Design a protein around this ligand. Structure first.
Ligand SMILES: *[C@@H]1O[C@H](CO)[C@@H](O[C@@H]2O[C@H](CO)[C@@H](O)[C@H](O)[C@H]2NC(C)=O)[C@H](O)[C@H]1NC(C)=O
Ligand SMILES: *[C@@H]1O[C@H](CO)[C@@H](O[C@@H]2O[C@H](CO)[C@@H](O)[C@H](O)[C@H]2NC(C)=O)[C@H](O)[C@H]1NC(C)=O
Ligand SMILES: *[C@@H]1O[C@H](CO)[C@@H](O[C@@H]2O[C@H](CO)[C@@H](O)[C@H](O)[C@H]2NC(C)=O)[C@H](O)[C@H]1NC(C)=O
Ligand SMILES: *[C@@H]1O[C@H](CO)[C@@H](O[C@@H]2O[C@H](CO)[C@@H](O)[C@H](O)[C@H]2NC(C)=O)[C@H](O)[C@H]1NC(C)=O
Ligand code: NAG
Ligand code: NAG
Ligand code: NAG
Ligand code: NAG
Ligand code: NAG
Ligand code: NAG
Ligand code: NAG
Ligand code: NAG
Ligand code: NAG
Lengths: 137, 248, 109, 381, 122
């Protein structure tokens, strides 16, 4: 069985006549390793739960990223920042990190004062391009 | 040539008429991948490479994309996206001689499978065992090349088979080799069935102000319809509009 | 491989000019050098690169080339110039560089 | 015949930035005013490329020695050179770079290109000796000191020179991307005059195709051929060679990337986006547009590519008894056919065609090429 | 006074080995290549051997290829022409000279040693 992804240790138990696992029946979530009899579950390598908050390209070329439904401490683990280019390591961690209920937002400066919403991030959090000149949340 | 060092020849600036091969040679195998043999006359090819060698009768099945075996792994492998025609015919009268024809060699052993269209003509000793070969033959140290050993009394699957693999490229570059179809006049600004360098279509043509680079032949703004073509005789560029005026 | 053709001998009266010419097919495309070997002494460089005089050689000696032929002329034949004169050119024709010499001239004052 | 130079002494690596350089035309279809997305082998944007001066003067005494290292060939290379005196002349490509395996020779003298695929016995330091003639000095005669011997030649190609005559701050950037895919060595190049930029310039120049060579060889390592204007028998104190290596060359390795190429009205690639570089480019590749509007955009994955592969198979040692199945002295009749279970062994069919030739071999439900990297539950012959 | 003095030359029977030692003084010996040139009695000069500056490269005339070997010791600033299997035609006044050019195609001999007479006795 060939594929591309990440593996974690799983608490699932396999019957002796079972080798593969398919809870969704179109993706093999779990497998039994052939040499060591531990059961490893397979998570896809693709982390597409990321949304880029940007102004206009005409306005600016700097962005913020909202990693959806993950904790801010697990952002380098979830996106695999070690295997990314160093430009994506800027948005992996830094000073401008804000934990929201929608996700972890990196690249935008959190401000205590509140304004009207123009770019809806979610869970009551909004983003804007406001003053030098930078993206605020 | 032998199958381990197969002979590649470039075919260009000529007319590809295979109908002259009807009288002399009868081809036991003629399989075209990526093109139909009936449409082979009304087509123009950009570059054509003839890969010629000799194999056994039982090994002609291995000259195909997606095949494995001895030839397809160690001697001659075709790519998966292969566009071209494999031709093969029996040559027991020519290649095989009385007493054993040992002039054709093949590779038994290789450390890894060949990649498509690669030739390995190295005669270094294969290390089958754990002990180093040190450049001398012996136990677990075999010379990688061996003779077919063709005889006229051999079986059909052990008889010589000459193989020519014609590799093409269709409708991507200016073409130097074309089919037997005879060219006609150009009817501009009219709805007409057209055939430009093998590209068949129905529509109307207008003169275009586009400029083509010398390595470019076809033009596509949206990449699902050929806008402009370079006419093969006169080097003017003609853009093609569909004949259908459905905006009514 | 190619051989430089140099005259066996010249006879020049003193207080005159003495042109020494050797020609070869590759001398039109490669530099040539002149050495003086006085009898009983080692050869010394006189003219190199067909025109250039190193220091310590008197101003009498001058050299020039005319296509195939290269020449070595002396602006005043003093008795101290009675010696053996040789040509040299480098043949790069073979696998490795080669240095070809000439026959030599017996200059008599 | 070859000439032995000094020991290279393994100079430490030095890197430099390649600001959006190495983009070539992927296809030969005239495209005008369209944004085309191609997945191919491209040099990643803003990558670290390895820069080597052609002549390095690093010793305390003042030794000048060519930096001609043999460097790897990992899925393609971008060779960029900034020179002013034609001291770089070509390259050699191969695996062992000796008489055992075939190698590719590319060399540029004053008149034409020589492309040869033979079994060259390359020496440790291949170079071309260059000497000007005595009266003209308009061309430079070249002495070839690349290989000791050449045998089994299967390719020959001559055309107009890849490198133009550079015969004083008029440096030039010559860039070439070399690829060896499906038995063809594909070369792509662009020539641009540069000015007062020591390193690679910032800007965009698209590499037009040059030649597609049906070499059909395996390439793993490559080296750079340099011109030796000075003398190996007598090294000058200084100034004998070309100015202490102001001239230099840059080497970068291609990687599988997805690029969004923007073709303009005249059919030229005028701008590109690397989808893996930053999140703005991921948004651009998701929207297939170079300009994005204000707001939040969900982007598909382009940022991560696997570099290593792992294979995990059960602890099985013994080989399958295909000698019993295939080389039995008697076979069963077709009305009572013999079914045998094959288990607890390694299914290696490569030992089968040492002496047995199969006229029919048809696999249903599985491809014969994928039969090696598979494990079967129960096998019945 | 870039001076090159050699020694070690004398009469010999054919088929015996003789070693020539050319010393150097007054200049950077390692920075310059060196040659050997013989001059037969009554005949002109003839080049026989090359050694590189380091000693990493050496070529010999086709008449005496392989029959001689040439080496240099950069520490003792001494040039050596180890000769084996001498013949009748080898009688000459051998000169140790110094390569004088810095460009690849061409070279010349600006300084020359006084000479060693190698005589073969039939
Ligand atoms: C192309 O040549 C390289 C030469 O290194 C081959 O790589 C070697 O392959 C053998 C066979 O499995 C291995 O034992 C070596 O460890 C490999 N060496 C390296 C450095 O990778 C490569 O297999 C060849 N390619 C093809 C298609 O034959
Ligand atoms: C550059 O190299 C090419 C090939 O090595 C030379 O072209 C050949 O030169 C030989 C003479 O040595 C001729 O016999 C061939 O007919 C030439 N072939 C072609 C295709 O021209 C060329 O002369 C070299 N140029 C220079 C300036 O050295
Ligand atoms: C490649 O060149 C070598 C040169 O040694 C060839 O080896 C010899 O080739 C001649 C002529 O074919 C034969 O008569 C000899 O018997 C060969 N000797 C050896 C050592 O095999 C070799 O055949 C050539 N062909 C290839 C592709 O290897
Ligand atoms: C380059 O160096 C090699 C190794 O030092 C030289 O080859 C040796 O030459 C000596 C003297 O002729 C022999 O005794 C050795 O057997 C040779 N060894 C090898 C590895 O071939 C080579 O001649 C040098 N190249 C020159 C002088 O241009
Ligand atoms: C499989 O074999 C390897 C190599 O000897 C060994 O290290 C490993 O423990 C083995 N695994 C099992 C489950 O026996
Ligand atoms: C932004 O758009 C305006 C027109 O609305 C144009 O004049 C200006 O040049 C644009 N700037 C950039 C950086 O694209
Ligand atoms: C994220 O991790 C921190 C670490 O202590 C923890 O306090 C917080 O509750 C976590 N958030 C979520 C949503 O799990
Ligand atoms: C915002 O509120 C937090 C609450 O802890 C405080 O630490 C921070 O200094 C405040 N920032 C500003 C700009 O008022
Ligand atoms: C092709 O040949 C015909 C017949 O000689 C001629 O009329 C026509 O101009 C030619 N086209 C070219 C040379 O492009
Ligand atoms: C190049 O290497 C330097 C030093 O490790 C690093 O800071 C830089 O980010 C790298 N550039 C890349 C890989 O884009
Ligand atoms: C000088 O070189 C040029 C260019 O090769 C050539 O046209 C000309 O004939 C040469 N002249 C001489 C003096 O050889
Ligand atoms: C296209 O070529 C025309 C030639 O008239 C030129 O005017 C125009 O600037 C070019 N367009 C671009 C941007 O390449
Ligand atoms: C099959 O048996 C024959 C007869 O003993 C033997 O010559 C041959 O090598 C065997 N082949 C294999 C693959 O075992």
């Amino acid at each position: 069985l060939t594929g591309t992804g990440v593996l974690t240790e799983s608490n699932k138990k396999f019957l002796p006549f079972q080798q593969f696992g398919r809870d969704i029946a179109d993706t093999t979530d779990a497998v039994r390793d052939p040499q060591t009899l531990e059961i490893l579950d397979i998570t896809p390598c693709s982390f597409g739960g990321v949304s880029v908050i940007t102004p206009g390209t005409n306005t600016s070329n700097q962005v913020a990223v909202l990693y959806q439904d993950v904790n801010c401490t697990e952002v380098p683990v979830a996106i695999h920042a070690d295997q990314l280019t160093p430009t994506w390591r800027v948005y992996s961690t830094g000073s401008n990190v804000f934990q929201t209920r929608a996700g972890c937002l990196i690249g935008a400066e959190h401000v205590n004062n509140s304004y009207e919403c123009d770019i809806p991030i979610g869970a009551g959090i909004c983003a804007s391009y406001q003053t030098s000149q930078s993206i605020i949340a | 040539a032998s199958v381990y060092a197969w002979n590649r020849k470039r075919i260009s600036n000529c007319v590809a008429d295979y109908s002259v091969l009807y009288n002399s040679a009868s081809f036991s195998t003629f399989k075209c991948y990526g093109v139909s043999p009936t449409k082979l006359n009304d087509l123009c090819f950009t570059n054509v490479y003839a890969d010629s060698f000799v194999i056994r009768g039982d090994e002609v099945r291995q000259i195909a994309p997606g095949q494995t075996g001895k030839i397809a792994d160690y001697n001659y492998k075709l790519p998966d996206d292969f566009t071209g025609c494999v031709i093969a015919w029996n040559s027991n009268n020519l290649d095989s001689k009385v007493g054993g024809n040992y002039n054709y060699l093949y590779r038994l052993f290789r450390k890894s499978n060949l990649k498509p269209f690669e030739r390995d003509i190295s005669t270094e000793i294969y290390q089958a065992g754990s002990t180093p070969c040190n450049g001398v033959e012996g136990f677990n140290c075999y010379f990688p090349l061996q003779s077919y050993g063709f005889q006229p009394t051999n079986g059909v699957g052990y008889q010589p088979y000459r193989v020519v693999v014609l590799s093409f490229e269709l409708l991507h570059a200016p073409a130097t080799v074309c089919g037997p179809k005879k060219s006609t006049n150009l009817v501009k600004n009219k709805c007409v069935n057209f055939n430009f360098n093998g590209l068949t279509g129905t529509g109307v043509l207008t003169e275009s102000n586009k400029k083509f680079l010398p390595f470019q032949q076809f033009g596509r703004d949206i990449a699902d319809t050929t806008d402009a073509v370079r006419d093969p005789q006169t080097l003017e560029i003609l853009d093609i509009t569909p004949c259908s005026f459905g905006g009514v | 491989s190619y051989e430089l053709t140099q005259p066996p001998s010249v006879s020049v009266s003193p207080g005159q000019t003495a042109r020494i010419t050797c020609s070869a097919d590759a001398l039109a495309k490669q530099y040539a050098y002149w050495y003086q070997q006085k009898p009983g002494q080692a050869p010394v460089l006189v003219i190199y690169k067909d025109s250039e005089r190193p220091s310590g050689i008197p101003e009498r000696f001058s050299g020039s080339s005319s296509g195939t032929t290269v020449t070595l002329t002396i602006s005043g034949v003093q008795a101290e110039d009675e010696a053996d004169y040789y040509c040299q050119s480098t043949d790069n024709s073979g696998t490795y560089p080669n240095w070809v010499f000439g026959g030599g001239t017996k200059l008599t004052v | 015949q070859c000439v032995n130079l000094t020991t290279r002494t393994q100079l430490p690596p030095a890197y430099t930035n390649s600001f959006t350089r190495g983009v070539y035309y992927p296809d030969k279809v005239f495209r005008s005013s369209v944004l085309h997305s191609t997945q191919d082998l491209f040099l990643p944007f803003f990558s670290n490329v390895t820069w080597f001066h052609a002549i390095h003067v690093s010793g305390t005494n003042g030794t000048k020695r060519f930096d001609n290292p043999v460097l790897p060939f990992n899925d393609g290379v971008y060779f960029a050179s900034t020179e002013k005196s034609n001291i770089i002349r070509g390259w050699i490509f191969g695996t062992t770079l000796d008489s055992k395996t075939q190698s590719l020779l590319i060399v540029n003298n004053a008149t034409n290109v020589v492309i040869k695929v033979c079994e060259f016995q390359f020496c440790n330091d291949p170079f071309l000796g260059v000497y000007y003639h005595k009266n003209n000095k308009s061309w430079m005669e070249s002495e070839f000191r690349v290989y000791s011997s050449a045998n089994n030649c299967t390719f020959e190609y001559v055309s107009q020179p890849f490198l133009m005559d550079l015969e004083g701050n008029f440096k030039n950037l010559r860039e070439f991307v070399f690829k060896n895919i499906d038995g063809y060595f594909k070369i792509y190049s662009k020539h641009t005059p540069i000015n007062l930029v020591r390193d690679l310039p910032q800007g965009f120049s698209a590499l037009e195709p040059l030649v597609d060579l049906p070499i059909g060889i395996n390439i793993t390592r490559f080296q750079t051929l340099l011109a030796l204007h000075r003398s190996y028998l007598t090294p000058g104190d200084s100034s004998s060679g070309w100015t202490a290596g102001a001239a230099a060359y840059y080497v970068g390795y291609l990687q599988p990337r997805t690029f969004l190429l923007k073709y303009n009205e005249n059919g030229t690639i005028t701008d590109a986006v690397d989808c893996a570089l930053d999140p703005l480019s991921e948004t651009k590749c998701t929207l297939k547009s170079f300009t994005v509007e204000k707001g939040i955009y969900q982007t598909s994955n382009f940022r991560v590519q696997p570099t290593e592969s792992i294979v995990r198979f059960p602890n099985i040692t013994n080989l399958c008894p295909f000698g019993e199945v295939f080389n039995a002295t008697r076979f069963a009749s077709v009305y009572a056919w013999n079914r045998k279970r094959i288990s607890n062994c390694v299914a290696d069919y490569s030992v089968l065609y040492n002496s047995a030739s199969f006229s029919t071999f048809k696999c249903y439900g599985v491809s014969p090429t994928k039969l090696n990297d598979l494990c079967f539950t129960n096998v019945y012959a | 006074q870039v001076q090159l003095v050699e020694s070690g030359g004398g009469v010999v029977q054919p088929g015996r080995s003789l070693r020539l030692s050319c010393a150097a003084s007054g200049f950077t010996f390692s920075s310059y290549g060196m040659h050997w040139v013989r001059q037969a009695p009554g005949k002109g000069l003839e080049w026989v051997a090359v050694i590189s500056y380091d000693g990493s490269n050496k070529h010999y005339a086709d008449s005496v290829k392989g029959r001689f070997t040439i080496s240099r010791d950069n520490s003792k600033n001494t040039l050596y022409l180890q000769m084996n299997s001498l013949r009748a035609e080898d009688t000459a006044v051998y000169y140790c000279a110094k390569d004088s050019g810095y460009n690849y195609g061409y070279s010349w001999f600006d300084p020359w040693g006084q000479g060693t007479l190698v005589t073969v006795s039939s």
